[PDB]
Amino acid sequence: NPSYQQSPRHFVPTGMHSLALGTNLVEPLHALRLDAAGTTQHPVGCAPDEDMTVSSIASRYGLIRRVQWKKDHAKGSLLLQLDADPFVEQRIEGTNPISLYWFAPVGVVSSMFMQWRGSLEYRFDIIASQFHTGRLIVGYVPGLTASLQLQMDYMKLKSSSYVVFDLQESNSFTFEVPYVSYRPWWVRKYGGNYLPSSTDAPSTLFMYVQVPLIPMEAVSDTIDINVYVRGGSSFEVCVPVQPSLGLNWNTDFILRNDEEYRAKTGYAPYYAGVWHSFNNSNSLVFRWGSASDQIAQWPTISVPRGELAFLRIKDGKQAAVGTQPWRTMVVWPSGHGYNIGIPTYNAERARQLAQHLYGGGSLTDEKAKQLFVPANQQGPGKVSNGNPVWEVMRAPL
């Protein structure tokens, strides 16, 4: 046992391994695997078919658009003018307040990144019989602001880069959208729910009917056209940020309107209870907990002077239940720097109590304490269901 007299190392502790990192980096863990060096293995029949990869996804067409193209369309007539960005849209007729949208896979994968660059591709499928014949420009104007988004025609479009096409025999092709910007990359069109920092597309596609369709009488005047977005071979993204999109799996949302009233966060579920500082626990008061001084705290109601208010729950089912469900309540300051909620038998006792407290009367006053609900009423002491909304029963005083 020689003494190790030499000086000790001198680090700096930290509580956690890095999160954002995810590459050339061994990442220590407490494996629940039994073997010290074991690892998941893929049976040759279970082999990973797919090499997940940005390009691997980006190189996949998705239908994005369905132009109708009637015979009667003028040679000048536009068909569409979708933007030259991955984030092309396809709204669904979701009756939901949050309408859903189809996206080309490239747009979706793009949504996870702040920046992107490179060419795109639009396969066009002119679902048409060979006998149909027509011709149409699919031009590309760099640098259009929305004010200039209009004023367009196929002809101004011709001033910039464009491609004419002749529908006759082959009934489909693939335009390839150029990447042209002052910026080496390009900022995401949208972003996390945060409207500023949502720059629009660098440039815009167009497609006009350069020569009106000339169908035979024996075939239909209308012709369906379909548009397939796909990442170009040049296409690429870089910086990873919050995706600007959500799955349709749970299209549910909750507005934070302030109009409804309810207990402060972390103070629910609450139950009618007792508290020695309050009437010596001789009267009920909501508690978010059992240990002493776990009184539910409540937001301060803004009562204009000369009035009063008292809470009344919008749902008796969610009410904490003593001997009775407590659908009515009066919030008043604890005197300890927060607002306790005091259960009442009814909107009326709560009213009278408000007549008292907003009448400037104290909780200590008999008028209040008579309105206070006695500890015996606590009964089961059932908690409130979650943090139920309380209607604010304002009344003039």
């Binding site: 863990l29 695997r33 029949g45 279970c46 919050q242 995706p243 999109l245």
Partner: protein
């Protein structure tokens, strides 16, 4: 009044992400209410199968000192996309509500540190599991999703 045996809570352990929890209208979890979903599930959307492991790195509240155990139970089958979510176990009935022997487990000491860093092995008698939201069908199909079922209990 939980006994030391009791798991404080449980959840299925799956890549797809738990069924999204906006939270109550009374108590929205704004991050899901607002920052919908997240990346990994979003990419999970693109595939019908997966095989492999998961890391977790749970973060406990700091204020508590208490030692904390964590079971893994592969045995549990997930059942329906409903209850693909965190669950607060209550009164013991089955062995579900308590700490269990054979299952692999680990115990962080909050006083030392309040963040465990788990690794969940792939264990299924399947080629590979379902990846989209899982409605179930085959009774066997129920085993074929989550890697198992993690659970946590304070001492």
């Amino acid at each position: 009044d939980k006994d030391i045996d009791h798991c404080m809570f449980t959840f299925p352990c799956l890549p797809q992400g738990l069924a999204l929890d906006i939270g109550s209208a009374g108590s929205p979890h704004e991050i899901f209410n607002r920052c919908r979903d997240g990346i990994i599930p979003l990419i999970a959307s693109g595939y019908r199968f997966y095989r492999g492991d998961l890391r977790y790195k749970i973060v406990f509240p700091s204020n508590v000192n208490s030692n904390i155990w964590v079971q893994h139970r592969p045995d549990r089958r997930l059942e329906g996309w409903s209850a693909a979510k965190i669950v607060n176990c209550d009164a013991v009935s089955t062995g579900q509500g308590v700490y269990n022997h054979g299952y692999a487990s680990h115990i962080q000491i909050t006083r030392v540190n309040n963040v465990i860093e788990l690794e969940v092995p792939f264990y299924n008698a399947t080629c590979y599991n379902y990846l989209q939201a899982f409605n179930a069908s085959s009774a066997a199909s129920s085993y074929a999703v989550s890697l198992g079922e993690i659970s946590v209990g304070f001492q």
